[PDB]
Design a protein around this ligand. Sequence first.
Ligand SMILES: NC(=O)C1=CN([C@@H]2O[C@H](COP(=O)(O)OP(=O)(O)OC[C@H]3O[C@@H](n4cnc5c(N)ncnc54)[C@H](OP(=O)(O)O)[C@@H]3O)[C@@H](O)[C@H]2O)C=CC1
Ligand SMILES: NC(=O)C1=CN([C@@H]2O[C@H](COP(=O)(O)OP(=O)(O)OC[C@H]3O[C@@H](n4cnc5c(N)ncnc54)[C@H](OP(=O)(O)O)[C@@H]3O)[C@@H](O)[C@H]2O)C=CC1
Ligand SMILES: NC(=O)C1=CN([C@@H]2O[C@H](COP(=O)(O)OP(=O)(O)OC[C@H]3O[C@@H](n4cnc5c(N)ncnc54)[C@H](OP(=O)(O)O)[C@@H]3O)[C@@H](O)[C@H]2O)C=CC1
Ligand SMILES: NC(=O)C1=CN([C@@H]2O[C@H](COP(=O)(O)OP(=O)(O)OC[C@H]3O[C@@H](n4cnc5c(N)ncnc54)[C@H](OP(=O)(O)O)[C@@H]3O)[C@@H](O)[C@H]2O)C=CC1
Lengths: 287, 291, 293, 293
Amino acid sequence: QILSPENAPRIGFIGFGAMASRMGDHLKTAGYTISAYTPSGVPMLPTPLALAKQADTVVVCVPDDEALAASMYGENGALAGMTKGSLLINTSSVSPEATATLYEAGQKHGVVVLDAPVSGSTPEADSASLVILVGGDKDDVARAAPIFDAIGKLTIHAGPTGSGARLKLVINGIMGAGLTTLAESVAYGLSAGLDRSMLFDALDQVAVISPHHKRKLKAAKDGNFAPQFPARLMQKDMRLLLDAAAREAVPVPTLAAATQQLSLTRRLSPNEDYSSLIRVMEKIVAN
Amino acid sequence: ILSPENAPRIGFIGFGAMASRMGDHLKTAGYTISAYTPSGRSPSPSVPMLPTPLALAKQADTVVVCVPDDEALAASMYGENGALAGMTKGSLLINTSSVSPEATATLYEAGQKHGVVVLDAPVSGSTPEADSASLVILVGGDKDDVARAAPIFDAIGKLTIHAGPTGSGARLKLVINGIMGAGLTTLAESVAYGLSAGLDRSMLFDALDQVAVISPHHKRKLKAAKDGNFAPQFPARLMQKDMRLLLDAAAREAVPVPTLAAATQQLSLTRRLSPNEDYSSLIRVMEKIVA
Amino acid sequence: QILSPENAPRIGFIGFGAMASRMGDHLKTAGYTISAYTPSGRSPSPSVPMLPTPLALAKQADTVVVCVPDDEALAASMYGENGALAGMTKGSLLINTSSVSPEATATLYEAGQKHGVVVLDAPVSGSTPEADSASLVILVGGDKDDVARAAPIFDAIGKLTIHAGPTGSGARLKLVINGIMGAGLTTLAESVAYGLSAGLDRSMLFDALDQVAVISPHHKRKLKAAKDGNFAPQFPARLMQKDMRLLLDAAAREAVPVPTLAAATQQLSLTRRLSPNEDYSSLIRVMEKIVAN
Amino acid sequence: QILSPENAPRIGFIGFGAMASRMGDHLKTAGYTISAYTPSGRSPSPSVPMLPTPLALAKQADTVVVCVPDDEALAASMYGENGALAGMTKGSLLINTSSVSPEATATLYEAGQKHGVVVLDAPVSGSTPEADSASLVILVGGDKDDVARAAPIFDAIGKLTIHAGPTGSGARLKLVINGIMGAGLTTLAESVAYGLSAGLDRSMLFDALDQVAVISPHHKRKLKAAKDGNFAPQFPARLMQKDMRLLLDAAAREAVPVPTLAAATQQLSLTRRLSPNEDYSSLIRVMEKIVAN
Ligand SMILES: NC(=O)C1=CN([C@@H]2O[C@H](COP(=O)(O)OP(=O)(O)OC[C@H]3O[C@@H](n4cnc5c(N)ncnc54)[C@H](OP(=O)(O)O)[C@@H]3O)[C@@H](O)[C@H]2O)C=CC1
Ligand SMILES: NC(=O)C1=CN([C@@H]2O[C@H](COP(=O)(O)OP(=O)(O)OC[C@H]3O[C@@H](n4cnc5c(N)ncnc54)[C@H](OP(=O)(O)O)[C@@H]3O)[C@@H](O)[C@H]2O)C=CC1
Ligand SMILES: NC(=O)C1=CN([C@@H]2O[C@H](COP(=O)(O)OP(=O)(O)OC[C@H]3O[C@@H](n4cnc5c(N)ncnc54)[C@H](OP(=O)(O)O)[C@@H]3O)[C@@H](O)[C@H]2O)C=CC1
Ligand SMILES: NC(=O)C1=CN([C@@H]2O[C@H](COP(=O)(O)OP(=O)(O)OC[C@H]3O[C@@H](n4cnc5c(N)ncnc54)[C@H](OP(=O)(O)O)[C@@H]3O)[C@@H](O)[C@H]2O)C=CC1
């Protein structure tokens, strides 16, 4: 009962933005028929219910808990439109609480919900280099493998339901605080009189910055903050992680500070790349 | 022009984990090595030891300094027994220690009064990179004096960054130290959340090796931390000192750095609990909090 | 319209813990008849009749006062087949003194509107000693006319009613005050810890700080208690840390950078992990232990 | 040898700014003869003779009081052939009221000992209004008998002398109180900022916070001034942020984790960068402007 294009050709999306649309292109190449629902308007369906009624597998890619609940539940929601025995793959970055609510609601419809957020942004989605972080029973993960293989380079089975959502929060913290650390360290360097191009070029050559953050640093050198992961979404992910860390009573001061810097970043420019904090701190130092 | 032919003798003020490793690559490149340490001992028993900084400098052509902090630097640089009193006008002093911008300016000016150019040339990389001569040299000074020292820098490292005039190497080292320190505290806290939320420890450590948002340095520390291996490459006492220097400098420049400030406090706790183990032991500290 | 004991004698509580039980005694003294629902069926007041469900509580009260720990407990007891809201008559008032999120507040206000029920968000400034002495400060969101209706209830349990604005304003003002209280304590605990680490005599240091103008009366009381190792719960760490989580979530939703509040929250997470049930001021003891090793 | 006006009438000041000139007024009233040295030779007190060097100041004074901004200024005027120590006599007392580091305090104490001069580290709690009213709290480190020698001086300028311990204890206790003051302000600025960002009425919010028990009297006075946009300096951001820098350096040297104090320090760096000379409470305005955009 693998979800190959032979057994399950129709994949309906709930949400179809920068990430899901690039996933869909890869699933199309792999031989699936793609449909999609978005509250605004590949064939578009009018409701989540209608989307689910004409799909074999539903993939969800929505911004937050509120959007997830608005489209999963109620008589016009996605769950009302799928059939016992089918699978719902949620690739959204949402809270552990929302993950548990949807898993339990899926169980009442006979629908297995995999929490399968991804590591990687729009360039990795373009190249199908996403890393899938999936929670669920190993047998249900196996059913979704052709889907995961088409959109990504690696599927990490993180544990039972909820484990993928948690692993995504871990990686989001590392990403977000990695950027705020870099912006702050660059700002000190500029404030202490270091030549800007020297400094940016020097940091490209050290081993203590990630490949992801080195790519952001190079873009920031030219002032390029075209959105790959917009500040509004990075800051939301930081909010979710801090809430989850507080619920577990784990003290995370570096992540907490980073979140506040990303709040400023979102306020000043919600739609540019989250790396624009580098420019924000540069402007603080120049004034 | 400080090739082994022209200037074969390199004397070290301080000769511990980093400097003894640099000394081996300089020995291999053809230089004659000598050292001073306050204890009279070092990891390299085959290196002649001199009784004072003054005595070390009087029998070396170039002096390399590698001491723990500002206070150690002033103790061995100044006064009638210090290194400056022993070097000759026109020679180079190369400071690879991680010290404050204030200490750097004090030594440069003191050097000028002796006719000695002081390059502030801290390095990026730890004991594994010193072993393999993969250090990145971060050097402040005039471009002509930097060119004079290139044979020395090439022997101990894989890249020399001319950061600007005197003081620029010290500042760039502070920048890179902040990225390293807060990179570790970020990773320790993120791992701690994951464990507190029920993720299998072995799965989580292995999964994070697979993602592009952790640096190669911090991936190596995560693998060591999976093994409980915190043998000192960069001890907490020195990493936390370096964070203290960075936050002092950021406050003097009035630059708000909340992520770096949070990370420093986590590294204070790390040093308090274990000053001599690797600074990455914060990962173990956080694991014990969540247990 | 005024919810005096003559016009509306029956006050039913959803939640009846440390704070609500003390408000109930002042409401009993003012002439009201008190009833309550809790999930355990128990309360600090054995004389108070217990109803078996939130719906049953609401069906036999003229006014309902809610005092529950968090958003989840609120939703569990106001909504669903046995929730309290559907048990209330049109034109009646629901008074929520719980410290919950602005989102939970907006959801309850809108659900109340659908049922014809006015919901006042009326959290309180003060802890169990202020509840004991009816010296709470009520922070209330709603229309002036609806606040006026609740005035005899607010007057019995508190010393001052601040009309913070329309619906949601009380909840927001409570979060502001919570932030000041939480970070005031973490600031004090960390400053004391430096002092002790630098060799200052403990008794001298605690007494000296009682003499300075830069500590609040509330935190000076906590400092004297901490000198005695007295962390009997007035505001337990589990609830203070929850309130800080709510404040940081709200500040993130508004995109306001609050690094001092964010750091304080992490210190209170450690405090709650080590002792969820003692007073939140126990971080002072936590920090003393860190510097002693 | 009590340092009464009859026993030691001449008090010479090293530094004579906002704090010291007010101290000197109260010492003049108490019967002392005041002189001063400043690097600019300028001071708002016309009756105070200005001496041209720290050396010259100390040579014509019986007791020397120091009130300089930081470690660097202290070392410039204390040491060397033209410094103050070179001009005082064995058996005299130097009273340092400056807010300086523990390291600077130890260095001056030991330098004083080589000169036979006892150095009391005696920073003060309180700002320009407290110096005007001699309401300062003196925080003094040293031997009990030397503190007793300085009692008439301390009584003239303040309302309370806290003997914090041996040499260095006053410097450390000042750092403790500075942290409480600075983080108390940043907490308050961020909490107000959240409340405004969440739509609360500004005048409502400022007036409500004046009524709560979790804000100190000092910070309530700052909040009232901020309601009017008044940040005329009493304690300028450049000096408060310097004191926070000293506290965080000392906390790092003691390896004490203080995340709330560290976060507050960074907010006060932003405050100093935007306006070094206005009152440190100007962060309230900084945060209002962030939220207003
Ligand atoms: N680099 C990245 O972009 C990363 C993204 N993620 C996560 O992936 C998810 C989406 O990312 P991205 O695709 O970039 O975000 P986008 O904002 O680009 O796409 C958002 C999509 O969600 C749709 N949507 C909004 N509300 C609803 C709703 N109530 N029901 C159904 N669909 C809805 C929008 O449709 P409309 O146009 O009608 O609003 C749009 O199609 C988020 O959870 C994000 O955090 C995680 C890591 C990295
Ligand atoms: N990963 C690392 O290890 C990194 C190191 N650095 C910087 O390099 C410098 C040294 O690091 P490392 O070599 O690891 O530290 P070590 O402690 O291993 O070496 C310290 C050396 O300094 C000597 N020393 C101490 N006080 C004095 C003094 N007053 N005069 C002369 N020598 C003295 C010690 O001699 P004795 O044994 O007699 O005390 C020992 O030889 C520090 O500034 C450190 O921050 C920078 C980045 C990373
Ligand atoms: N100083 C303080 O204590 C302050 C408290 N507050 C806020 O006041 C509220 C109550 O505080 P406090 O009285 O101290 O808390 P307590 O923990 O002392 O009492 C909690 C009460 O809520 C009840 N409860 C739990 N879950 C539910 C539910 N789903 N439905 C109904 N009742 C429920 C408990 O009943 P059971 O025993 O059956 O669980 C108990 O009666 C919280 O929001 C707190 O943050 C605000 C400021 C200060
Ligand atoms: N609320 C406050 O203002 C409080 C301040 N403090 C501490 O008290 C000290 C001074 O505070 P305040 O008086 O307000 O600061 P001011 O800036 O008002 O006065 C500074 C004084 O120091 C003098 N000065 C500067 N450098 C030297 C030097 N090298 N040698 C001698 N004198 C020097 C200046 O002289 P010139 O004018 O010639 O530069 C000026 O007279 C600082 O340590 C401050 O942190 C402590 C408690 C309260």
